[PDB]
Amino acid sequence: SALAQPPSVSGSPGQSVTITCTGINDYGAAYKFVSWYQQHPGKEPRLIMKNVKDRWSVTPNRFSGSTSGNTASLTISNLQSDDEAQYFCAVYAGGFTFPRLGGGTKLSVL
Amino acid sequence: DRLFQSGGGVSRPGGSLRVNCGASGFTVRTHYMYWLRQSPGKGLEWVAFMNSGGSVSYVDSVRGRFSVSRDNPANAMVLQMDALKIEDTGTYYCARELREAWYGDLRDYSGLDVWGRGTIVSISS
Amino acid sequence: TELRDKREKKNALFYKLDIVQLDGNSSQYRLINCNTSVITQACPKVSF
Numbered sequence A: 001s002a003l004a005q006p007p008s009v010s011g012s013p014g015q016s017v018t019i020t021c022t023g024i025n026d027y028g029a030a031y032k033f034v035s036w037y038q039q040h041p042g043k044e045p046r047l048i049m050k051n052v053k054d055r056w057s058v059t060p061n062r063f064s065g066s067t068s069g070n071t072a073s074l075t076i077s078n079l080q081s082d083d084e085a086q087y088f089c090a091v092y093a094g095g096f097t098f099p100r101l102g103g104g105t106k107l108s109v110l
Numbered sequence B: 001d002r003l004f005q006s007g008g009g010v011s012r013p014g015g016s017l018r019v020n021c022g023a024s025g026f027t028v029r030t031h032y033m034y035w036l037r038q039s040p041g042k043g044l045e046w047v048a049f050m051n052s053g054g055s056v057s058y059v060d061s062v063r064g065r066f067s068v069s070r071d072n073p074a075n076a077m078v079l080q081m082d083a084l085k086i087e088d089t090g091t092y093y094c095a096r097e098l099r100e101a102w103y104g105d106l107r108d109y110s111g112l113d114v115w116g117r118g119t120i121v122s123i124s125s
Numbered sequence C: 001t002e003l004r005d006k007r008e009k010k011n012a013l014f015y016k017l018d019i020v021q022l023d024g025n026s027s028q029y030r031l032i033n034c035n036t037s038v039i040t041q042a043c044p045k046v047s048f
């Protein structure tokens, strides 16, 4: 089935919030590659993070990753208007046919 | 690298449509490719996958109805869709994935790095 | 080795690209191919 994301999160500008990603160890013990995706409204997905804490190309420092075995956490600090977007957690492992995709969470800045 | 899409459009239930996905900077025929769809206001969902070897896996909900084929002269893939249903309405995406499978066996995985802008498909009566 | 009761702790070096991280704690590692296939050493007289 699908990973668990809370539908929506909210926070004040400049602060930090975390989006959680639960159920990672539901299917097998294979090493869980954890990925994160940003999508602005009307835009396509853009890859944010791989390997729970590994930043990708142009992603600033404000994005960080952590993990608790079955729950991953993507934290964003110094909240700003650009960050308002839809986020998707995903996990892949060897033998998978498709990587498991989260339900997505809308992040809004107050 | 870039991907560019065309096709899609309007169809009655049971009709047929077709979407092209062409690449630049690299050839489709030697990479891992994915077809996904997203219904309006909803989340992404898998549709089809073609490996570097060219064998294709379909999700059950479209097996027997959707078919992907390589267009090597155009350096593209084609999603042909027949027996269209209402549920098939949404925006479709063709995407490229980068992985590392050394001597067959895998060790490293990036994810989906290249994403087409998507084509709109509307099945209506 | 070799009395099948006296096991010993040994160590050696393997080029990184031949090692995979085990499906669990990052301190644990596995040979690249061993859940999947049989691995054989090449014999010195048979170097082709």
Ligand SMILES: *[C@@H]1O[C@H](CO)[C@@H](O[C@@H]2O[C@H](CO)[C@@H](O[C@@H]3O[C@H](CO[C@H]4O[C@H](CO[C@H]5O[C@H](CO)[C@@H](O)[C@H](O)[C@@H]5O)[C@@H](O)[C@H](O)[C@@H]4O)[C@@H](O)[C@H](O[C@H]4O[C@H](CO)[C@@H](O)[C@H](O[C@H]5O[C@H](CO)[C@@H](O)[C@H](O)[C@@H]5O)[C@@H]4O)[C@@H]3O)[C@H](O)[C@H]2NC(C)=O)[C@H](O)[C@H]1NC(C)=O
Residues within 6 Å of the ligand: A057, B001, B002, B113, B114, B115
């Ligand atoms: C063997 O050795 C060779 C040589 O070392 C290795 O090749 C290297 O491989 C790297 C991995 O791909 C290459 O890095 C990529 O570079 C491209 C851009 O390269 C061009 O531009 C460089 C300069 O860019 C800067 O400056 C320009 C202005 O001049 C500025 O606009 C840029 O923003 C940037 O600041 C040149 O120096 C270079 O020669 C070349 O002309 C870069 O775009 C790649 O990032 C990609 O990131 C993800 C995937 O990680 C991808 O999705 C991105 O696309 C997304 O974003 C773009 C917009 O940016 C959008 O169009 C897409 O639709 C997506 O939304 C993006 O493509 C990546 O950083 C490196 O260039 C290359 N080296 C050489 C000399 O070619 C090779 O890997 C080695 N192999 C092995 C096995 O060892």
Ligand SMILES: *[C@@H]1O[C@H](CO)[C@@H](O)[C@H](O)[C@H]1NC(C)=O
Residues within 6 Å of the ligand: A069, C024, C025, C026, C027
């Ligand atoms: C070993 O496994 C435990 C179980 O969760 C974990 O807390 C610990 O961080 C692991 N150690 C390493 C080095 O991964």
